[PDB]
Design an enzyme around this catalytic site. Structure first.
Site, PDB file in Angstrom:
ATOM      1  N   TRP A   1       0.853  -1.191   0.000  1.00 53.03           N
ATOM      2  CA  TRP A   1       0.000   0.000   0.000  1.00 53.03           C
ATOM      3  C   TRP A   1       0.894   1.248   0.000  1.00 53.03           C
ATOM      4  O   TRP A   1       1.776   1.376   0.859  1.00 53.03           O
ATOM      5  CB  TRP A   1      -0.878  -0.025   1.253  1.00 53.03           C
ATOM      6  CG  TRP A   1      -2.089   0.844   1.197  1.00 53.03           C
ATOM      7  CD1 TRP A   1      -2.125   2.205   1.286  1.00 53.03           C
ATOM      8  CD2 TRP A   1      -3.451   0.414   1.064  1.00 53.03           C
ATOM      9  NE1 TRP A   1      -3.422   2.655   1.207  1.00 53.03           N
ATOM     10  CE2 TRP A   1      -4.257   1.577   1.069  1.00 53.03           C
ATOM     11  CE3 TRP A   1      -4.068  -0.837   0.932  1.00 53.03           C
ATOM     12  CZ2 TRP A   1      -5.649   1.526   0.949  1.00 53.03           C
ATOM     13  CZ3 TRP A   1      -5.451  -0.887   0.813  1.00 53.03           C
ATOM     14  CH2 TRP A   1      -6.226   0.288   0.823  1.00 53.03           C
TER      15      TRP A   1
ATOM     16  N   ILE B   1      -2.298  -4.368   8.401  1.00 53.38           N
ATOM     17  CA  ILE B   1      -2.982  -5.331   9.281  1.00 53.38           C
ATOM     18  C   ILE B   1      -2.389  -6.741   9.159  1.00 53.38           C
ATOM     19  O   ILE B   1      -2.390  -7.512  10.121  1.00 53.38           O
ATOM     20  CB  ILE B   1      -4.518  -5.406   8.999  1.00 53.38           C
ATOM     21  CG1 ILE B   1      -5.197  -4.038   9.178  1.00 53.38           C
ATOM     22  CG2 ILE B   1      -5.201  -6.479   9.865  1.00 53.38           C
ATOM     23  CD1 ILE B   1      -5.320  -3.554  10.617  1.00 53.38           C
TER      24      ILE B   1
ATOM     25  N   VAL C   1       0.872   4.349   6.898  1.00 55.43           N
ATOM     26  CA  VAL C   1      -0.568   4.526   7.063  1.00 55.43           C
ATOM     27  C   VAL C   1      -0.887   6.020   7.098  1.00 55.43           C
ATOM     28  O   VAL C   1      -0.403   6.743   7.975  1.00 55.43           O
ATOM     29  CB  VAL C   1      -1.125   3.816   8.327  1.00 55.43           C
ATOM     30  CG1 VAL C   1      -2.648   3.920   8.369  1.00 55.43           C
ATOM     31  CG2 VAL C   1      -0.703   2.352   8.360  1.00 55.43           C
TER      32      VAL C   1
ATOM     33  N   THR D   1     -12.418   9.430   7.765  1.00 56.24           N
ATOM     34  CA  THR D   1     -13.153   8.668   8.780  1.00 56.24           C
ATOM     35  C   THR D   1     -12.218   8.248   9.925  1.00 56.24           C
ATOM     36  O   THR D   1     -10.992   8.307   9.771  1.00 56.24           O
ATOM     37  CB  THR D   1     -13.872   7.406   8.191  1.00 56.24           C
ATOM     38  OG1 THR D   1     -12.934   6.333   8.021  1.00 56.24           O
ATOM     39  CG2 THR D   1     -14.567   7.715   6.863  1.00 56.24           C
TER      40      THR D   1
ATOM     41  N   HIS E   1     -11.338   5.542  10.695  1.00 51.54           N
ATOM     42  CA  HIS E   1     -10.721   4.265  10.316  1.00 51.54           C
ATOM     43  C   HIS E   1      -9.213   4.251  10.571  1.00 51.54           C
ATOM     44  O   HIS E   1      -8.675   3.247  11.046  1.00 51.54           O
ATOM     45  CB  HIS E   1     -11.023   3.915   8.853  1.00 51.54           C
ATOM     46  CG  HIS E   1     -10.656   2.510   8.474  1.00 51.54           C
ATOM     47  ND1 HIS E   1     -11.596   1.513   8.310  1.00 51.54           N
ATOM     48  CD2 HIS E   1      -9.453   1.939   8.221  1.00 51.54           C
ATOM     49  CE1 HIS E   1     -10.987   0.389   7.975  1.00 51.54           C
ATOM     50  NE2 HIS E   1      -9.687   0.620   7.913  1.00 51.54           N
TER      51      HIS E   1
ATOM     52  N   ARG F   1       9.958  11.572   5.581  1.00 50.33           N
ATOM     53  CA  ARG F   1      10.522  10.685   6.602  1.00 50.33           C
ATOM     54  C   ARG F   1      10.915   9.313   6.047  1.00 50.33           C
ATOM     55  O   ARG F   1      11.120   8.360   6.815  1.00 50.33           O
ATOM     56  CB  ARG F   1       9.542  10.525   7.774  1.00 50.33           C
ATOM     57  CG  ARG F   1       9.336  11.782   8.621  1.00 50.33           C
ATOM     58  CD  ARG F   1       8.056  11.677   9.457  1.00 50.33           C
ATOM     59  NE  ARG F   1       7.782  12.879  10.248  1.00 50.33           N
ATOM     60  CZ  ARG F   1       7.276  14.014   9.759  1.00 50.33           C
ATOM     61  NH1 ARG F   1       6.995  14.132   8.465  1.00 50.33           N
ATOM     62  NH2 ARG F   1       7.058  15.043  10.566  1.00 50.33           N
TER      63      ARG F   1
HETATM   64  O1  LIG Z   1      -0.476  -0.266   5.065  1.00 48.52           O
HETATM   65  C1  LIG Z   1      -1.598   0.260   4.923  1.00 48.52           C
HETATM   66  N1  LIG Z   1      -1.676   1.618   4.931  1.00 48.52           N
HETATM   67  C2  LIG Z   1      -2.844   2.278   4.783  1.00 48.52           C
HETATM   68  O2  LIG Z   1      -2.862   3.528   4.794  1.00 48.52           O
HETATM   69  C3  LIG Z   1      -4.062   1.438   4.606  1.00 48.52           C
HETATM   70  C4  LIG Z   1      -3.926  -0.034   4.605  1.00 48.52           C
HETATM   71  N2  LIG Z   1      -2.681  -0.547   4.768  1.00 48.52           N
HETATM   72  N3  LIG Z   1      -5.166  -0.527   4.439  1.00 48.52           N
HETATM   73  C5  LIG Z   1      -5.606  -1.927   4.351  1.00 48.52           C
HETATM   74  C6  LIG Z   1      -4.756  -2.924   5.149  1.00 48.52           C
HETATM   75  O3  LIG Z   1      -4.476  -2.432   6.470  1.00 48.52           O
HETATM   76  C7  LIG Z   1      -5.352  -4.339   5.226  1.00 48.52           C
HETATM   77  O4  LIG Z   1      -4.755  -5.121   4.185  1.00 48.52           O
HETATM   78  C8  LIG Z   1      -6.880  -4.435   5.108  1.00 48.52           C
HETATM   79  O5  LIG Z   1      -7.515  -3.820   6.234  1.00 48.52           O
HETATM   80  C9  LIG Z   1      -7.355  -5.883   4.988  1.00 48.52           C
HETATM   81  O6  LIG Z   1      -7.379  -6.531   6.265  1.00 48.52           O
HETATM   82  C10 LIG Z   1      -5.951   0.562   4.340  1.00 48.52           C
HETATM   83  O7  LIG Z   1      -7.224   0.464   4.167  1.00 48.52           O
HETATM   84  N4  LIG Z   1      -5.352   1.761   4.435  1.00 48.52           N
HETATM   85  C11 LIG Z   1      -5.975   3.082   4.369  1.00 48.52           C
HETATM   86  C12 LIG Z   1      -6.336   3.550   5.774  1.00 48.52           C
HETATM   87  C13 LIG Z   1      -7.756   4.104   5.818  1.00 48.52           C
HETATM   88  C14 LIG Z   1      -7.782   5.633   5.822  1.00 48.52           C
HETATM   89  C15 LIG Z   1      -7.742   6.232   4.412  1.00 48.52           C
HETATM   90  C16 LIG Z   1      -9.076   6.107   3.677  1.00 48.52           C
HETATM   91  O8  LIG Z   1      -9.952   7.170   4.060  1.00 48.52           O
HETATM   92  P1  LIG Z   1     -11.247   6.928   4.994  1.00 48.52           P
HETATM   93  O9  LIG Z   1     -10.854   7.527   6.325  1.00 48.52           O
HETATM   94  O10 LIG Z   1     -12.349   7.676   4.275  1.00 48.52           O
HETATM   95  O11 LIG Z   1     -11.437   5.424   5.026  1.00 48.52           O
HETATM   96  O1  LIG Z   2      12.549   6.522  23.079  1.00 49.06           O
HETATM   97  C1  LIG Z   2      12.167   7.084  22.031  1.00 49.06           C
HETATM   98  N1  LIG Z   2      11.868   8.407  22.101  1.00 49.06           N
HETATM   99  C2  LIG Z   2      11.450   9.102  21.023  1.00 49.06           C
HETATM  100  O2  LIG Z   2      11.184  10.316  21.126  1.00 49.06           O
HETATM  101  C3  LIG Z   2      11.330   8.355  19.745  1.00 49.06           C
HETATM  102  C4  LIG Z   2      11.668   6.916  19.714  1.00 49.06           C
HETATM  103  N2  LIG Z   2      12.073   6.353  20.882  1.00 49.06           N
HETATM  104  N3  LIG Z   2      11.466   6.512  18.442  1.00 49.06           N
HETATM  105  C5  LIG Z   2      11.631   5.198  17.801  1.00 49.06           C
HETATM  106  C6  LIG Z   2      12.059   4.036  18.698  1.00 49.06           C
HETATM  107  O3  LIG Z   2      11.214   3.954  19.852  1.00 49.06           O
HETATM  108  C7  LIG Z   2      12.024   2.678  17.989  1.00 49.06           C
HETATM  109  O4  LIG Z   2      13.263   1.999  18.226  1.00 49.06           O
HETATM  110  C8  LIG Z   2      11.708   2.733  16.487  1.00 49.06           C
HETATM  111  O5  LIG Z   2      10.287   2.769  16.307  1.00 49.06           O
HETATM  112  C9  LIG Z   2      12.249   1.524  15.726  1.00 49.06           C
HETATM  113  O6  LIG Z   2      11.690   0.309  16.261  1.00 49.06           O
HETATM  114  C10 LIG Z   2      11.053   7.620  17.799  1.00 49.06           C
HETATM  115  O7  LIG Z   2      10.766   7.591  16.541  1.00 49.06           O
HETATM  116  N4  LIG Z   2      10.951   8.748  18.521  1.00 49.06           N
HETATM  117  C11 LIG Z   2      10.524  10.074  18.051  1.00 49.06           C
HETATM  118  C12 LIG Z   2       9.258  10.520  18.786  1.00 49.06           C
HETATM  119  C13 LIG Z   2       7.977  10.019  18.123  1.00 49.06           C
HETATM  120  C14 LIG Z   2       7.478  10.928  16.997  1.00 49.06           C
HETATM  121  C15 LIG Z   2       7.737  12.414  17.234  1.00 49.06           C
HETATM  122  C16 LIG Z   2       8.780  12.935  16.250  1.00 49.06           C
HETATM  123  O8  LIG Z   2       8.184  13.812  15.293  1.00 49.06           O
HETATM  124  P1  LIG Z   2       7.277  13.267  14.074  1.00 49.06           P
HETATM  125  O9  LIG Z   2       5.869  13.324  14.619  1.00 49.06           O
HETATM  126  O10 LIG Z   2       7.531  14.270  12.975  1.00 49.06           O
HETATM  127  O11 LIG Z   2       7.793  11.869  13.799  1.00 49.06           O
END
Ligand SMILES: O=c1[nH]c(=O)c2c([nH]1)n(C[C@@H](O)[C@H](O)[C@H](O)CO)c(=O)n2CCCCCCOP(=O)(O)O
Ligand SMILES: O=c1[nH]c(=O)c2c([nH]1)n(C[C@@H](O)[C@H](O)[C@H](O)CO)c(=O)n2CCCCCCOP(=O)(O)O
Ligand SMILES: O=c1[nH]c(=O)c2c([nH]1)n(C[C@@H](O)[C@H](O)[C@H](O)CO)c(=O)n2CCCCCCOP(=O)(O)O
Ligand SMILES: O=c1[nH]c(=O)c2c([nH]1)n(C[C@@H](O)[C@H](O)[C@H](O)CO)c(=O)n2CCCCCCOP(=O)(O)O
Ligand SMILES: O=c1[nH]c(=O)c2c([nH]1)n(C[C@@H](O)[C@H](O)[C@H](O)CO)c(=O)n2CCCCCCOP(=O)(O)O
Ligand SMILES: [K+]
Ligand SMILES: [K+]
Ligand SMILES: [K+]
Ligand SMILES: [K+]
Ligand SMILES: [K+]
Ligand SMILES: [K+]
Ligand SMILES: [K+]
Ligand SMILES: [K+]
Ligand SMILES: [K+]
Ligand SMILES: [K+]
Lengths: 146, 147, 146, 147, 147
Positions: C13, C46, C68, C73, C75, C114
């Site tokens: 996706w 998922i 994601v 919504t 969702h 990112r």
């Molecule tokens: O990696 C992803 N990234 C994603 O962004 C994603 C994924 N996956 N799936 C589907 C999968 O999570 C999954 O394969 C299905 O749910 C099947 O179980 C999604 O429906 N999405 C879209 C998230 C829903 C939000 C965007 C659509 O707008 P809405 O808020 O109007 O529904």
């Molecule tokens: O202790 C932390 N403290 C942290 O502040 C941190 C951590 N950890 N990780 C990532 C790690 O927790 C983790 O190892 C990674 O997810 C990889 O597994 C982060 O990405 N962060 C960044 C904070 C979360 C998101 C806020 C940063 O700004 P953004 O919203 O633009 O991403």
């Protein structure tokens, strides 16, 4: 309720309110014919679940008491999350009522008003103990007897 | 007092300065209570804390987790903290061991600095957390089977 | 880290960004002396947890990659909920580091910035892999040897 | 080919019209991939989905869950979706089986209709979910023990 | 024909009047379906429901949980409902038994009254919940091993 084995675990953070909550529980306990329940103190609310687990191996009911007051960071949200998850898991693991008497408020006034002080609107410590003892009695009736 | 308790400390490195402060508070409380050399382990991120605490729990009476998570511009902040809460809670009950929570979760950088225990800080979470772990370990020792 | 067994699972996706995230992971892998990690693709986020569980039975570290993006919504909030719950449960069941490199953004620009493209501010795919490899080496040292 | 996979579908009845659309998308994708007759089971509400998926998981390679939850005037909406999330995730990991998520969660009825796969809809969640299940089953087949 | 199913009902007493309504709806549905005498148990609060449903599940084919939680001035409301959600979902999957959810969660007292099944109510959640439990029990009976 003269036959039930009661245990009480209460946190010390915000000491005055804890004493009130603990005071309400003991009164209800004595009223129902239990003069000496097991009382244990801890330092924080996060430490409650692990001590309730140990208490559950030797009692028919456990009462948890404490106060969590919101601050300026989202930390408040995560302390209460842990307590919720912990106590629920312990109750079902051990098949034992773990009564929830942990206050979660926005301000200090709100907590004081729900602890059972002279001019309080309510007393959560008493409610919680009545909940534990009654659920214990019910489970005794449902379960295997002669 | 607590000369007989076996303490372990796991701290993340993200935002290194604050980590050092948190770690510094823990060690001082430890030395004060008669424990001169606790087990110290470093990790890269907060998400990696729970899995290392599980391993440390099979050889210690108490574990202290230290770190800082600061909010950004995305809802990512909310999901990092969610994992930490779920993980640590599950570990504590699986192993019947106090896993003290000393991971800061703030809105700004100033807020985190003010809660770390630097010269002009309002409080020190690293110290509070260690005092929480040691005391809960002592309680469990008294409740449990002894002679 | 020439002795570590690495596995990578990435969702499809939003394909462009996935390629970037996957590209960062492989580079760090090669730099650390691991020339060919196990790479598996899935259709959605998922589906990641259940594939990581299987990968965990013969690797010392697993890296999860995906994006994601929020819609109109609520969702968005439930897809991220599942991923957080799933990965956390897998790591503790298998005692294996499952690095989290799944982006969760408000806009498409945020995700692009990112991913580690020519003009991006950071690269989550690289950070995640460094996290996995280091945690695996630590566990190796803590555990039983020789 | 997907002709060897054993598929099961559980769908709730609350808001019947949309359910039929969701279920119709799933069956089409199923037939396209060479599976003419999957196991179809109906329930009354979304909360009832997890416990029926658990039973279906004991003799299928993939399970698809379908349904619609629409928000009201109380915080009730938040708690129905919370259960579904928790339940399905737990079932998939217990049984090591892909449980595809095709349960709509919307603010309005228009939003739900637009994502079900009717003549003039923008997308079809029932189709996407089934493609997700069948592909993950094939992958697990290849990774696992074979000769 | 649900004359063979063994039903159990657990209801909290906090807000007594509404509880009586919810309980009244369940028993009527029960009698209509040919079950004249289900197992009825009362508890003091909603948090106490999960632990009593676990015990009831060892001897019944379906359990119905009934109660009312009304929001106050503190975030306490959020944590009572969180517990109930996690508890009931865990019990259902542990015991492979439908635990129907008939616990009201409202913003005001009028809203709760309107959904309990009193003379002038818009709906009756006690009735809907029992219909959900008995139907899911019948389906599981059909799917499972029979001769
Ligand atoms: O990696 C992803 N990234 C994603 O962004 C994603 C994924 N996956 N799936 C589907 C999968 O999570 C999954 O394969 C299905 O749910 C099947 O179980 C999604 O429906 N999405 C879209 C998230 C829903 C939000 C965007 C659509 O707008 P809405 O808020 O109007 O529904
Ligand atoms: O202790 C932390 N403290 C942290 O502040 C941190 C951590 N950890 N990780 C990532 C790690 O927790 C983790 O190892 C990674 O997810 C990889 O597994 C982060 O990405 N962060 C960044 C904070 C979360 C998101 C806020 C940063 O700004 P953004 O919203 O633009 O991403
Ligand atoms: O009963 C309590 N009640 C409490 O109110 C409490 C407790 N305990 N602990 C600490 C304990 O949860 C625990 O001992 C520690 O987490 C150590 O693991 C706290 O840090 N608190 C403070 C609550 C957090 C909110 C206030 C902090 O200020 P801030 O949000 O402005 O940063
Ligand atoms: O598939 C569904 N889809 C649904 O949309 C649904 C379902 N099921 N149930 C009930 C079921 O979750 C379940 O059968 C019952 O809770 C009984 O256990 C609902 O109450 N709903 C209605 C959505 C809940 C939010 C609205 C609640 O009403 P209010 O907020 O206006 O008071
Ligand atoms: O069925 C219920 N329905 C309820 O509405 C209820 C219950 N139970 N309990 C307590 C019980 O859940 C339980 O006995 C206790 O948790 C003790 O374990 C409550 O405190 N309540 C009230 C909910 C919040 C309590 C105080 C009111 O909110 P406020 O403090 O924000 O003003
Ligand atoms: K017991
Ligand atoms: K009996
Ligand atoms: K230990
Ligand atoms: K003893
Ligand atoms: K492994
Ligand atoms: K060693
Ligand atoms: K299976
Ligand atoms: K193979
Ligand atoms: K049963
Ligand atoms: K059969």
């Amino acid at each position: 309720a003269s036959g039930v084995r009661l245990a009480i675990v209460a946190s010390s953070w915000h000491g005055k309110i804890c004493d009130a909550l603990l005071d309400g529980a003991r009164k209800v306990a004595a009223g129902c014919g239990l003069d000496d329940p097991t009382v244990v103190r801890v330092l924080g609310a996060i430490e409650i679940p692990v001590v309730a687990q140990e208490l559950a191996r030797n009692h028919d009911a456990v009462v948890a008491l404490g106060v969590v007051i919101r601050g300026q960071t989202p930390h408040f949200d995560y302390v209460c999350d842990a307590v919720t998850q912990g106590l629920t898991r312990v109750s079902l693991d051990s098949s034992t009522p773990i009564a929830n008497g942990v206050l979660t408020t926005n301000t200090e006034e709100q907590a004081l008003d729900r602890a059972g002080l002279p001019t309080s609107a309510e007393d959560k410590g008493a409610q919680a103990t009545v909940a534990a003892l009654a659920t214990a009695l019910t489970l005794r009736e449902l379960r295997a007897h002669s």
